[PDB]
Design a protein around this ligand. Structure first.
Ligand SMILES: Nc1ncnc2c1ncn2[C@@H]1O[C@H](CSCC[C@H](N)C(=O)O)[C@@H](O)[C@H]1O
Ligand SMILES: Nc1ncnc2c1ncn2[C@@H]1O[C@H](CSCC[C@H](N)C(=O)O)[C@@H](O)[C@H]1O
Ligand SMILES: Nc1ncnc2c1ncn2[C@@H]1O[C@H](CSCC[C@H](N)C(=O)O)[C@@H](O)[C@H]1O
Ligand SMILES: Nc1ncnc2c1ncn2[C@@H]1O[C@H](CSCC[C@H](N)C(=O)O)[C@@H](O)[C@H]1O
Lengths: 328, 328, 328, 328
């Protein structure tokens, strides 16, 4: 037993649309326990010595900020910062935790500000975040009144980062991160909203990815798809021979207009391209909480409009779509 | 969805030894829901009409009796009696519920009085009742201070009877009836005590039945085995060509002395034959709550020492045994 | 039992690289037998009436032509023509059988002439033809000295057409048609050459299709990939919203240059674009042996450079590639 | 690959009643290959240097005797005897192989003479020998005109002994030994006759064993059941606490009369008890080809009517029964 999912099993037991998940999830999490991870024991030892207990003040509306009305013990703060730095690299955020600023590789707040204006309100929505990272966006979703956020990300580190923030939130049961890939879910059709941001290009079968997302939505449910694109029309689709911006094992980089046709082909409606953004080195860079290489190292050193391999430089698109039917 | 097992899923989620059961149980219960039963909708409509409150007084020590301090509405009592009579036939009890006497085919209290003197105290024990009927003996086990009783019986009706009594008990979560056969359980090794009373003769493989029971016990756990026997030494074993006392699909009726050797062969220790009882027509008979044929109709009408088919008449034996190891 | 695969089971039993196929194939063919097809009984009755002997003369080098030295009974020839016409529609050929000319929708000989100059000699090669139709090209592969041809096509009719020709060939055991999709094959790595001609656009996951092909090749084995393309560079990929040339359930129409990158990404080497051909209405048309609609009906009736839907008109490309390693 | 079952797969491919076995057998034999056996490599090296080629003379009617019209090379005979002695212990026989007398622990010929008078003639019958040992009785079955004998025995040594005799028979394809237990067969209903001799007492579930035998028979098919019994009526059934005659992991020793009721309960007809034999120390003993302990060591040294443990001494019964239906 690396990590006990008792609390999640309890939650989906008591939910008429997620209870069917109990037919496959428990054996998958049993298997995940037995594939020992080198670092997980160390990570857990550090997670366990993070302070337990509810903070006085939580902002998950405008940021992800935790504080106490009481200034914290100087020495307990120094320990906490050291524990959180154990979970390097911190890629998604930022977080402000009792005045500790976790300056993540990504300004994940900026992507959130690009998405929020275009989505159906999250008030009392159940949400699936596919490839949620450490779950930054799930906190922002609860900030907007979401009833339940389930994240899936196969990274052991991001489950520990998520549980660190969730413990510092006082053990909030309205968000959960499951160490799965999207390919491991059955057809649940349980969620009002599904996010898939930064996942499509990692999937060998892009149309199967779009069908797997459609299969998690209630009828009239909403998809937010975010992915790396190129410029062009409905037949502009980059598939790199080698790496794209130093990423291994990436596949399809369609144009936003191609992706819209793809979403229509698999049976989404009201498909809208709502945002295209050329990723600046201020949205993604090396920081003191993520000391590895980042976007500046992945660009042509003489031409920021190209990756080091010669392809057009990272461009992220947001599409919003509806699964057919009325939303009940 | 005939019946939602949400509350049982929640319980085993939070239990270190039963959580592994989530790896097979939910699909089995999903399959059970989809094998529609003719009567279950009617039964459920009646179960849902039974009053929802906690009663003021419960005796599960000396009987199974429920009452209120303030006498019930005269008309609400007549309705309750009608709802409970919906669940005909009532084979196992008796029960007294707000002065309504459920006069069951069996005096299940009499078997309980024969068993109780020979068992390890149930205080704080987790118990499995294999072939529990409507759960009569599970209430008596909670009466003796059992922490947890899980019953398994594949009868749809007995699940409805159990849930009727459990609702009238105020929704007591310390007992549960799962609509399974013992062959559907994985090796849990989770229970301090296991009861198998009246099951062994129904099982084609008696030694597999005994191993299945052993597989639900913690180290040093206690088995209570009760079954129909014949008289004789370690090599006396009736297997009827015909029916036995009108029962179809029955197999092994060993002597109590043979059954002791059987338990020893499969690896039980301290095996004790503690009681043999020739079933009288006062223990099992037709009543107003079970109007079908019963033991008097199954006996030779000229010789009550024989079944209608000519075999020795029903004789029940109780054996108690320990699974190897020290009991922690 | 629609059709007994006894002879194929016998063949792979005695073959060191294909025997492992017996671990999944027989259940798949058992399942296929039990999904009754409306027409198969009629087809079989006609197949069984086709003469059983070996013919005196076979040309599978320059065409697929069968004849006898002594002219056939005038009346037996009229019966044979009637039996073969039972298997309408005849899409792939042509065939000449005892002077009966099967004028197929497709001039499959023309594709064969475009392919043959670019392939490694087939002498003593084992070959997989993926989506083989009635097996026309497998006869041409045996013509070129292939040791073994295994075809897979999920069409019931094309299995009957193949078995009709194979019976008229004298029951030649060097070619076989299995009623499977490529997704049903395990990783065999058993074949010197693999053909996939006209399949890729039908597959939702094009890169999975290419890996499935790679998984049937011995080390250093050769792939012949033929498919519908569009014009353009490495980022030209049509995915139609609509039908393409009246076809339902089609997906990816990359450029030949894009397809070369795709084959390189999934790990093929020495990838060569060897031919592009704009399909003329002389290559594919309605005939007396295939009386349904064909390419002329699928083209814009005012502009043969476009499909009826407005996309560029059918253009077929041939690519040849090697699986990594030396070919033993 | 310990042993290649190519020839068996070929045979059941071409048999309409055994072909369905290909749905499960190949994965089971693949798994059996990968459970490496310490001795199998050595055994195989010795099997491979046994002379290949047909003998001139075979008696499988009155014994199992192989000879050449030509007396054999003195030195080749010395090598052969040494190779065959590699496969110690030789429990079932005897065999006479080019004048080499393999004096087996058991006089298996004597059991054959007790069985033969009572069975339906084997001429053109397909036969299953369940727990066939090295396949001695399958040779005697072919001697009586059996068309096909399939043996199953999970002992790696007995498969090597069988292949040694089968190679010395010239590679006779009418008999085969599969390294399986009876529990691994699906319901084939393929065999005219089934033998189960010396197996029932090794099976934890005796009634499941009798059903598994019934499941291998064509309708109107014949069972020969042979097993260790006690004396007594329909309720005489020994189940030993410990060992019986030094055997570990044995279960039910019913009387012949009990076993007859058991066969009727599971649905056999025309059940006849045809022979009971108290095993003499001349039927089973230590020999120069089986140097381990044997029946004399397993008996009370002062009372040959008892096993060393005190139970009645070995008594073997033969029952013959019919599966319901007419035999087509
Ligand atoms: N098969 C799979 N299913 C789900 N998530 C996956 C996945 N393979 C990779 N991922 C995750 O997808 C994430 C892509 S990075 C994007 C993170 C976050 N959604 C954001 O928009 O900022 C990584 O955290 C990676 O672990
Ligand atoms: N495979 C199986 N597993 C568990 N219970 C079974 C079973 N087959 C039958 N039963 C149940 O076993 C019970 C036998 S009657 C005995 C009931 C109760 N234990 C008592 O002692 O009075 C019935 O309720 C029947 O439904
Ligand atoms: N999943 C799949 N696997 C294999 N073949 C398939 C398939 N789906 C369709 N096919 C077959 O692929 C063929 C495409 S038509 C091309 C036929 C032939 N290879 C030629 O070049 O002329 C059809 O016969 C169709 O039945
Ligand atoms: N589960 C199983 N299925 C089939 N055979 C089994 C078995 N378990 C044991 N056996 C085999 O049963 C045999 C019993 S000894 C009897 C051998 C022969 N039938 C005879 O009558 O002389 C042994 O060879 C043993 O390996």
């Amino acid at each position: 037993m690396m990590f006990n999912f008792a609390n999640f099993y309890q939650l989906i037991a008591q939910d008429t649309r997620l209870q069917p998940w109990l037919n496959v999830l428990p054996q998958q999490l049993t298997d995940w326990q037995n594939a020992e991870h080198g670092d997980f024991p160390r990570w857990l030892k550090a997670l366990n010595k993070i302070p337990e207990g509810a903070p006085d003040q939580i902002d998950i509306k405008h940021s992800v900020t935790i504080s106490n009305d009481t200034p914290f013990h100087q020495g307990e703060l120094k320990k906490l910062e050291s524990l959180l730095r154990t979970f390097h690299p911190w890629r998604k955020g930022p977080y402000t935790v009792h005045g500790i600023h976790i300056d993540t590789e990504w300004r994940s707040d900026w992507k959130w500000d690009r998405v929020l204006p275009h989505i159906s309100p999250l008030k009392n929505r159940s949400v699936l975040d596919v490839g949620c990272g450490n779950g930054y966006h799930m906190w922002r979703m609860l900030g907007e009144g979401a009833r339940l956020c389930v994240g899936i990300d196969p990274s052991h580190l991001f489950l520990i980062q998520f549980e660190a923030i969730r413990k510092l939130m006082g053990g909030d049961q309205r968000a959960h991160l499951l160490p799965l890939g999207i390919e491991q879910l059955p057809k649940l059709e349980a969620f009002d909203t599904v996010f898939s941001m930064g996942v499509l290009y990692h999937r060998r079968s892009p149309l199967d990815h779009l069908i797997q997302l459609k299969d998690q939505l209630v009828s009239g449910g909403e998809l937010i798809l975010e992915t790396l694109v190129i410029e062009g029309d409905e037949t502009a689709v980059l598939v790199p021979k080698e790496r794209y911006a130093q990423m291994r094992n990436v596949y399809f980089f369609p144009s936003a207009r191609a992706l819209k046709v793809w979403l229509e082909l698999v049976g989404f409606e009201d498909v809208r391209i709502v945002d295209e953004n050329v990723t600046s080195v201020d949205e993604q860079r090396t920081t003191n909480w993520m000391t590895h290489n980042s976007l500046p190292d992945y660009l042509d050193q003489n031409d920021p409009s190209k990756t080091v391999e010669g392809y057009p430089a990272p461009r992220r698109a947001i599409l919003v779509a509806k699964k057919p039917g009325h939303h009940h």
